[PDB]
Design a protein around this nucleic acid. Structure first.
Ligand SMILES: COC(=O)[C@H](O[C@H]1CC[C@@H](n2cc(C)c(=O)[nH]c2=O)C1)P(=O)(O)O
Ligand SMILES: OC[C@H]1O[C@@](CO)(O[C@H]2O[C@H](CO)[C@@H](O)[C@H](O)[C@H]2O)[C@@H](O)[C@@H]1O
Ligand SMILES: [Mg+2]
Ligand SMILES: [Mg+2]
Ligand SMILES: [Mg+2]
Lengths: 551, 412
DNA sequence: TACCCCCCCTTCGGTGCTTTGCACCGAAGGGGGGG
């Protein structure tokens, strides 16, 4: 007997009245079979026509088993049922497990059906059972327990399980129980004779409250199958990963491939998905087939060579420090390894998000450090010490001069190339004896036609016509011109806030091919000074070049 | 056994539903230890997923404290009770507190645990304690008493508060006392030795009414404003005058008397940026009168109690940080600059965390409000590190901005 | 043809300043995974 959980509907709304789906005769017989046994145990009940609700029902067979699953479509009940607050805040990772002398894994049989639903709420679960023909009406039932398919079933099960385990955990403080839904990982430093004894006291303590531990689900010997992993006494690994062998790939093929590759990335180091994902962008139909680029083919090739050789992770030793090492992989891809003893990884992973239109490797590495810090605080509750492929002086130059606040926790340089560097450096002061280019651009909002040009103090001048452009693009284009038509050292005066915002953040990559060309020039120069003046204030060469390109 | 004051949210508004963020090991243990002893004392009591509301929770160490302190992020709850701490039971603000030669901040939050909370309102104080590696699902609680850090807490306790204080407010008539949530601000024009003594007297005066005090020392008369300043050069380059003209152009949105016509004249050619340009008679006079206009106060700037406070922060480099507090754009109530805070020349996020606390403290002393911050920092960067450096029992509102310094207006 | 949680990659639309273009972010629909 476990205390029921009070539940309500969204205030001012009534229960679910929706008609049944037409069910297949192969499914119906196995369905009516399972339903009838429930009434013997008090899990389900017959109800009179006094109950005016109805909800569709169907079944699919359990994965890795013979039996069927009773799934009740409560989508219309879910819309009108109150909101909950889930207590499942994440997923455990094996790399967060300390090593235990003896370990047991046990599943609960019929998890939801062992928890009684709310008394007053039971009536809204109403559904009817089909038959081999349409003549017999079938009994209508109300759930006495948590139904599979409701939006309140998982949360109520998870919290109830915690109240059951709480007494046992306080009586046995040195037992670690990883509670995730109905699966329990239980481990101890106890001697295995004593461990199995405490295991049985817990199976009784769950049986104290009507929770069944089937022997078939119960595992006594490594390697345990837990959360899609295989747990060995001193190592762990994922259950093997199957990559589709298709000769012609659709959109759903790549989606399956990418998702598998992401799952593999947690332990298999160096998985890369950039070039494969580029095929996924902007395709209309999931059924459509798209060929593999020579880039995506090479990436899928080397991704398979990583999966070829088996890999494993280790377990967590609270005494020793946590280490995280990052390598650059190119095209905005980064992989990392978290370890405590060298060359014995705890877990791996990858950061590849392209955040923003224009960026540089330093920003992206910082984003990787932040992703790794949070993942580490999730799994181990602490921040690892970092091994980063960026010179100490590069970083000092970046974070001190940049106008936004940025930081990286304790870290040391690791000489593993390719190194992260800043590719150019704008002067803080104007360059003496460098030609001074006053640039500007302008475009017509309706024509989409524009000009871009400059004037210098030495008399040099240029204006360029432009097709299908914008005001912003002509301002970048004017700066491109000044960079092309100048020596190795140049002062550039613009009144473009937009352009100057982009270039001063020292990007080394850009979605805009124009910015990438501006970057390419900036790497070539030896000294570049950018200065800003306001427009239409009668300043110097700015007023002159605004006249030229507006005409 | 005390009467519970009824509390209702703002009209047509639902409680807070804010996910809990990951906590470090040392912070979770502190919470589980703090939350255990709070439960055997009846202060909180476990709940379940039937309660749809949630608020983030974490732990801090005040400056030099050495001891964990539980902090709840009631920002979302406080915005949804806003009628309560304003309309009926609000606390007036003492305009003379900013004038006292010394002010001490004390944590009186432990007294709010005395008063019970309205039972119908306890469903909104729900918080969840996470577990390392998600070993356990979320352990949920809710508050039975006045929660620390709720804006409704000091309002309800005010009646009981003003009674405990009344004997000391009469024994010391001209000493100012202000209450902003879990903190008590007490200031005097007394000398430092006398001032620290009367605090101890106020600590005992609180002990016999049942309260501990796990204090910060301020000096509001010392606080200084940072005005807009124009450089001093013997020779001006085209680039110098261009930077100057742009700066004056920007500053003109604040002080309308700014003129640039005679300084613009000096640029009218197409000159090299490093070329030295002698100032004309009229430019020197336009410059001099401009420097004087910036010396003046801004016309028509005053504090409006109905309006929220906004604060912008700019990182100037070399440990320098400048800020402006305003309600309407370009009508600045205060401008200032910090330097050599904790973290200078090593940690940006710690310095910015220290600046937000300083600016918030100043705003509580001067107007009894906490400003909404415009933080010069990326979202993911701030949310990754700020709790490691937070040393206050309140949390201001913030947003994230990216303003490249086209012109260095606030620092030379 | 059900429910809950985490992850990555992409699209798209709200939002505000860089201004009616461009950039950013978050919701969401695709996938992987857990039960
Ligand atoms: O998994 C389990 O252990 C099952 O537990 C219950 C807890 C979550 C529930 N559940 C599960 C699945 C897989 C699913 O698709 N849908 C679903 O609602 C059933 P089981 O007792 O049937 O084995
Ligand atoms: O709540 C949305 C989002 O922002 C956070 C922190 O940035 O929310 C907190 O801060 C906001 C800005 O001050 C407040 O308005 C909000 O009430 C408060 O929860 C995170 O909690 C969340 O990811
Ligand atoms: Mg099961
Ligand atoms: Mg299971
Ligand atoms: Mg122009």
């Amino acid at each position: 007997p476990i205390e029921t959980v009070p539940v309500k509907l969204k205030p001012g709304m009534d229960g679910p009245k929706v008609k049944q789906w037409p069910l297949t005769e192969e499914k119906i017989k196995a369905l009516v079979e399972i339903c009838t046994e429930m009434e013997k145990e008090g899990k389900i009940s017959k109800i009179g026509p006094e109950n005016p609700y109805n909800t569709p029902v169907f079944a699919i067979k359990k994965k890795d088993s013979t039996k069927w699953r009773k799934l009740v479509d409560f989508r219309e009940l879910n819309k009108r049922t109150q909101d909950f607050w889930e207590v499942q805040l994440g997923i455990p990772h094996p790399a967060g497990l300390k090593k235990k002398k003896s370990v047991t894994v046990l599943d609960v049989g019929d998890a939801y059906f062992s928890v009684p639903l709310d008394e007053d709420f039971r009536k809204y679960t109403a559904f009817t059972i089909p038959s081999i023909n349409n003549e017999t009406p079938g009994i209508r039932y109300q759930y006495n327990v948590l139904p599979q398919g409701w939006k309140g079933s998982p949360a109520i099960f998870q919290s109830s399980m915690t109240k059951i385990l709480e007494p046992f955990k306080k009586q046995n403080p040195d037992i670690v129980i990883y509670q995730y839904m109905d699966d329990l990982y239980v481990g101890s430093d106890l001697e295995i004779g004593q461990h199995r004894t405490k295991i049985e006291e817990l199976r009784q303590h769950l049986l104290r409250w009507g929770l069944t531990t089937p022997d078939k689900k119960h595992q006594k010997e490594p390697p345990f199958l837990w959360m899609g992993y295989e747990l060995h006494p001193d190592k762990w690994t994922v259950q093997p990963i199957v990559l589709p062998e298709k000769d012609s790939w659709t959109v759903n093929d790549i989606q399956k491939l990418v998702g598998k590759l992401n799952w593999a990335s947690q332990i298999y180091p160096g998985i890369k998905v950039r070039q494969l994902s580029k095929l996924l962008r902007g395709t209309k139909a999931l059924t459509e087939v798209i060929p593999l680029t020579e880039e995506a083919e090479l990436e899928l090739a080397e991704n398979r060579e990583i999966l070829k050789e088996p890999v494993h992770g280790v377990y967590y030793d609270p005494s020793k420090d946590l280490i995280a090492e990052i390598q650059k992989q190119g095209q905005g891809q980064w992989t990392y390894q978290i370890y405590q003893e060298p060359f014995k990884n705890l877990k791996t992973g990858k950061y590849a998000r392209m955040r923003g239109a224009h960026t540089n490797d330093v920003k992206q590495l910082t984003e990787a450090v932040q992703k790794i810090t949070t993942e580490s605080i999730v799994i181990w509750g602490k921040t690892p010490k970092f091994k980063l492929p960026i010179q100490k002086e590069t970083w000092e130059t970046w974070w001190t001069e940049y106008w936004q606040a940025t930081w990286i926790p304790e870290w040391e340089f690791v000489n593993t190339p390719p190194l992260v560097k800043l590719w150019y450096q704008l002067e803080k002061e104007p360059i003496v004896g460098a030609e001074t280019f006053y640039v500007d651009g302008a475009a017509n909002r309706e024509t989409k036609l524009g000009k871009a040009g400059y004037v210098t103090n030495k008399g040099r001048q240029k204006v360029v016509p432009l097709t299908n452009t914008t005001n912003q693009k002509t301002e970048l284009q004017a700066i491109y011109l000044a960079l092309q038509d100048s020596g190795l050292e140049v002062n550039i005066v613009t009144d473009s806030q937009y352009a100057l915002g982009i270039i001063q953040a020292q990007p080394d990559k850009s979605e805009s091919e124009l910015v990438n060309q501006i970057i390419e020039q900036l790497i070539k120069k030896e000294k570049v000074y950018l200065a800003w003046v306001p427009a239409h204030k009668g300043i110097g060469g700015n007023e002159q070049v605004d006249k030229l390109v507006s005409a | 056994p005390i009467e519970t004051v009824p509390v209702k949210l703002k009209p047509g508004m639902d409680g807070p539903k804010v996910k809990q963020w990951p906590l470090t090991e040392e912070k979770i243990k502190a919470l589980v230890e703090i939350c255990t002893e709070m439960e055997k004392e009846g202060k909180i009591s476990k709940i379940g997923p039937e309660n749809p509301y949630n608020t983030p929770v974490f732990a801090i160490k005040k400056k030099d404290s050495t001891k964990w302190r539980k902090l709840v992020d009631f920002r979302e709850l406080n915005k949804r009770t806003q009628d309560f701490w304003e309309v009926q039971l609000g606390i007036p603000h003492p305009a003379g507190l900013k004038k006292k030669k010394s002010v001490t901040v004390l944590d009186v939050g432990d007294a709010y645990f005395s008063v019970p909370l309205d039972e119908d309102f306890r469903k909104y104080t729900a918080f969840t304690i996470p577990s390392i590696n998600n070993e356990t699902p979320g352990i949920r609680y809710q508050y039975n008493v006045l929660p620390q850090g709720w804006k409704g807490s000091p309002a309800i306790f005010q009646s009981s508060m003003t009674k405990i204080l009344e004997p000391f407010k009469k024994q010391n008539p001209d000493i100012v006392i202000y209450q902003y949530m879990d903190d008590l601000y007490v200031g005097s024009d007394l000398e430092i030795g006398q001032h620290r003594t009367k605090i101890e007297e106020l600590r005992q005066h609180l002990l016999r009414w049942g309260l501990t005090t796990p204090g910060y020392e301020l000096h509001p008369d010392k606080w200084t404003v940072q005005p807009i300043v124009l450089p001093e050069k013997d020779s001006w380059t085209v680039n110098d005058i261009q930077k100057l003209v742009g700066k004056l152009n920007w500053a003109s949105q604040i002080y309308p008397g700014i003129k640039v016509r005679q300084l613009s004249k000096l640029l009218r050619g197409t000159k090299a940026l490093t070329e030295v340009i002698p100032l004309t008679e009229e430019a020197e006079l336009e410059l001099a009168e401009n420097r004087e206009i910036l010396k003046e106060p801004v016309h028509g700037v005053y504090y409006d109690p109905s309006k929220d406070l906004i604060a912008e922060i700019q990182k100037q480099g070399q440990g320098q940080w400048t800020y402006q507090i305003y309600q309407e754009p370009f009508k600045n109530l205060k401008t200032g600059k910090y330097a050599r805070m904790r973290g200078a020349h090593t940690n940006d996020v710690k310095q910015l965390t220290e600046a937000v606390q300083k600016i918030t403290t100043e705003s509580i002393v001067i107007w009894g409000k906490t400003p909404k911050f415009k933080l010069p920092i990326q979202k993911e960067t701030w949310e990754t590190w700020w709790t490691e450096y937070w040393q206050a029992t309140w949390i201001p509102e913030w947003e994230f901005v990216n303003t490249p310094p086209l012109v260095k207006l606030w620092y030379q």
